[PDB]
C-alpha cells in the first residue's frame, strides 16, 4: 500500500471490478488483479489442532 491505492496502476484504466469468489479485485481492461486476499481474521482456515 502506497499513495491512494485505487484504479489500475498498470494500464491506466480506472475501471476495476470485484471477484467475490476469490475475494479479488481485478482490472476491467488489462485483466490485472489488484488484491486477492480481502481478509485477515482467520476463523478456521490456517493452523489445525484437535
Ligand atoms: Zn489495467
Curated annotation (Swiss-Prot):
Signal sequence, renumbered to the chain: none
Start-end of TFIIB-type zinc fingers: 3-35
Binding-site residues for Zn(2+), renumbered to this chain: 8, 11, 27, 30
Family label: Belongs to the TFIIB family.
Function: Stabilizes TBP binding to an archaeal box-A promoter. Also responsible for recruiting RNA polymerase II to the pre-initiation complex (DNA-TBP-TFIIB).
Protein name per the record: Transcription initiation factor IIB
Record organism: Pyrococcus furiosus (strain ATCC 43587 / DSM 3638 / JCM 8422 / Vc1)
